[PDB]
Amino acid sequence: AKTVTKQRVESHFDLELRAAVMHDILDMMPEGIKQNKARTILQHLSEAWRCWKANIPWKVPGLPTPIENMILRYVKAKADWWTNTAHYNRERIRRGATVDKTVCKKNLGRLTRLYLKAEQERQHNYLKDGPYITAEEAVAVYTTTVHWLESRRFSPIPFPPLSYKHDTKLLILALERLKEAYSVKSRLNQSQREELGLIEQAYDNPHEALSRIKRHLLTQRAFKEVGIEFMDLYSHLVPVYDVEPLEKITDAYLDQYLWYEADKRRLFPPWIKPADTEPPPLLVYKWCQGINNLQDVWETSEGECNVMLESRFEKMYEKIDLTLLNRLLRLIVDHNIADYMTAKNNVVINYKDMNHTNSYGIIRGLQFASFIVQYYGLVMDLLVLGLHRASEMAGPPQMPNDFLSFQDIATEAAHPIRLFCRYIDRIHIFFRFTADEARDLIQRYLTEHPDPNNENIVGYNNKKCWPRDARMRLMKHDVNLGRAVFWDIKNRLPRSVTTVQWENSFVSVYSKDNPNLLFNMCGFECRILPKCR
Amino acid sequence: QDPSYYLKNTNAETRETLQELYKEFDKLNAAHYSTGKVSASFTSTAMVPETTHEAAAIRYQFVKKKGYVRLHTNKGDLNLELHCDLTPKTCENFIRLCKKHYYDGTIFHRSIRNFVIQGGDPTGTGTGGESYWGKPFKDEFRPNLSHTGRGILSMANSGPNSNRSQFFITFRSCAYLDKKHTIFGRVVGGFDVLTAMENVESDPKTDRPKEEIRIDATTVFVDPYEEADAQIAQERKTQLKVAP
Amino acid sequence: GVWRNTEDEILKAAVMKYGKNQWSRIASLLHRKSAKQCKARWYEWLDPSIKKTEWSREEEEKLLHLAKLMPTQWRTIAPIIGRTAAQCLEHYEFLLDKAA
């Protein structure tokens, strides 16, 4: 007899599972029953496994109870084998030991089905268990948003005018964005050639396209379902959405109009990055020189410690409540535009037999999604920094600052929070603390979290790529200061909105104890050592 | 704990916003084929997960064979048998009409030209009277006892859930009363009287008899639906002797 | 984008012959019609389980109640009330124009 090799794994496994089904179905049958119907039981089990693969609620109300329990138990065994096999496959593909295209595509389909099952679980649990955002927290964030909006004298973005002066040029830029994708001139398919024909139709007639776009912004609050897929980057999977081409053209031109509108009203303050003005290496150089050209920054003789914090926002996407986003966007733009924003995310995610409506996550396939993620991160900057310190960042609205200028050295040193940089979700704050304030923060941190065995040192995460001389030295005081700073940061942000993880964050303390300040902006690991030290 | 816990620097209109919000604010039921909610919640992630398998519930007119009511119609004491095995809703409607006098003391509701004669309805229109539930019982024609043959009593209705008291003995086989009126059963006695009432003079506007076979009394010689009611009462009283 | 009655009858016969999961097989029959267009035309217009009726007082009250409370998510609103999203949005705008 032949060995059960790699190509014969799943077939022999399903054959042995079917034989186990036969042996575990022949034995509760009593005397009688000519219609044993084991083929019908196999059809019931195959439909149950297919509906579990499809996340379809499978139920045959005419089915005996212990046969149904045996079916559920066998489907549980097959699902556990499927999930564990996908786990080992994803581990070995991340190691790169296994090089096989069919294994990669099977694993990607398995992970896509599992993630979409988890997302349908999350959406149904959200709609069944109510809003996670509570009420008074969102009301306070809404009120603070209204306060900052009245502080910045922001004239709101209206509905797009029917005779706009540069609507043709914004449509040209949107056509550049849309024709960037189809610049390969390959064989394509019918849907791609249909999208190219729609692009050339809007290229020939701009005016009917503009009228249709404003018509959909006024009227259309029901849209087509969106397809979804992934690519594997062999460490993680990143989704790609699939929208109707006419809605893609509408959202592209709408995105161009709102981006120019926010430029004209100067909605985004220049601490928000990625800005269009500079490359990210020049942004690294700007951040490094802004840390450089502060006053008395390296002199840690009296406990004025330098705290570099680089962190993220973790769940900044999936916890965005669309009704709260509707209320916040009615503040910013026209109410029909905000209703278009609200109804755009209320569409159905589809992948073959995966069909579930998105209602509490965000969709990154939208053109304006980049703008609203930057707006969401802006109001997170308002929540974390506070309105007074944010006004000290931006200066007056009539005379705004740049990314890294203030009004005075006193306007730096009035708060320990000195320098700020938000790169979408990566948050990079430079603090300069005094010894008494650092000791007070350490005291309150140990008040909430007492540690008599001094265990806070070993929970630190350091930059392992640098040498041991280059690494920041882990005594009790500076690591307790950094953990107190991260504790103080985590006390501001509520877990209903988002979270910040210590494992993803990196906090470095420059002191007289520690002559180097370490951070990593984009892909650039930067170590700072003063010439005094 | 406190609403202002995990909260600081509370705004004023926020505080009257929260102030305004606070100011404004089983023995015989084992059916063994189970509920599909557990398998549905196991095969999909869009519902509350269930780990304990739940059985499906089922009285559903637990009757004993067929009943026979001798209706004292105007052609004579004709015995019509309603089968609860054929149609238990029609048997419940006919037995409740015979008990609460929607058939006893009533006139013939309808009569076609030697096709079907409907009697035992207090309204006299064709589907009137009172069923067991107050509203008219569900109409469904059985395949074993259909609306075909001679003397075949059917709970006459214009559609589903419309048979209340009018029982239509069909003197000939017809597909018009099939799958439109609940076929209760067949006439067990007074077949010549039922044929004479079907062949009696009738105005075909409402298709109703001028010589209406009027059931003055309904002597229940057998009653399957009242046997089902007595069995349900006995099953209630067997558990009500210890748990009233 | 247009939908002839011949195409609608062909789509209905292809669904009743080929089931519901098969869609490229249906799109082979329907000329210049993709499977997504066939699925949207079936489940949005041609499905017989679509409530193609008029609104009750309870349905109007629930529609006005849900659209007043949680705003402008018709794919969320419509499975609660049993209508489709185009039906519920159209009838809500009709009730809004009746109020105005």
Partner: peptide
């Protein structure tokens, strides 16, 4: 033990804390 034949396809309550949050949002 009667087995109905298998027919293949291949061959709702919402929480009122939503409403409470929405009313607080309108206020």
């Amino acid at each position: 033990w009667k087995i109905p034949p298998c027919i293949s396809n291949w061959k709702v309550h919402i929480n009122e804390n939503f409403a409470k949050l929405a009313e607080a949002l309108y206020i």
